[PDB]
Amino acid sequence: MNIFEMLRIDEGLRLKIYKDTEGYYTIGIGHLLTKSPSLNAAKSELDKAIGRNCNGVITKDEAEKLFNQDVDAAVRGILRNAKLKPVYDSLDAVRRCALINMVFQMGETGVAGFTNSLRMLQQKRWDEAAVNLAKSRWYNQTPNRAKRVITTFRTGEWDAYKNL
């Protein structure tokens, strides 16, 4: 299992503009287009993103292309972030994937806000950190996904994704 397979389990694949768990306009493998309520604004962002007139629909190919960009940017964002970098560097390869997953779903900003959990992960207090991560809007709003990510940080293995 790798970051791409993991994220593709969590986000799914949709070739037509759709709405977020949050109601936001998205396409592909969890690629947020706009937080704006117009389908028209979304369509425009889409065409801007792909470089063609898409009419709200893309190919598998174009979806994976966007996905490669998004993963790359998530990693690069972690590496550029003063709060995130140190935690990332402290972690093993599997747990690194769990942090990347949070960043992809919620943005650098959002994750950098989990001060206390970050501190615990750095200290390698796995059980403590998992209890603290669960005390969040994130866990309450997307509990099955949060619980997969959380198990991954707890265990350092891929079992939560074996099932799936």
d(C-alpha 103, C-alpha 147), whole Å = 16
Which candidate, 2, 41, 37, 22, places its Cα nearest to that of 107?
22
Catalytic (active site) residue 20: yes
Is 118 annotated to bind ligand?
Answer: no
Q: Is 11 a catalytic residue?
A: yes
Q: Supply 87's token pair.
A: 């935690």
Q: Name the resolution in angstroms.
A: 1.7
CATH class of 1-164: mainly alpha
Helices 3-11, 60-80: inter-axial angle, 10-degree rounding: 110
3-class SS of residue 14: strand
What residue segments make up the domains of the chain, in order of their start? 1-164
Method: X-ray
- Where does the chain show beta strands of DSSP type E? 14-19, 25-28, 31-34
Q: In whole angstroms, give the CA distance from residue 30 to residue 11.
A: 5
Alpha-carbon dihedral of residues 6, 112, 87, 97, nearest 10 degrees?
0
Q: Is 32 annotated as a binding residue?
A: yes
Q: Is 153 annotated as a binding residue?
A: no
Q: Which one of the listed residues 11, 45, 62, 70 is annotated catalytic?
A: 11
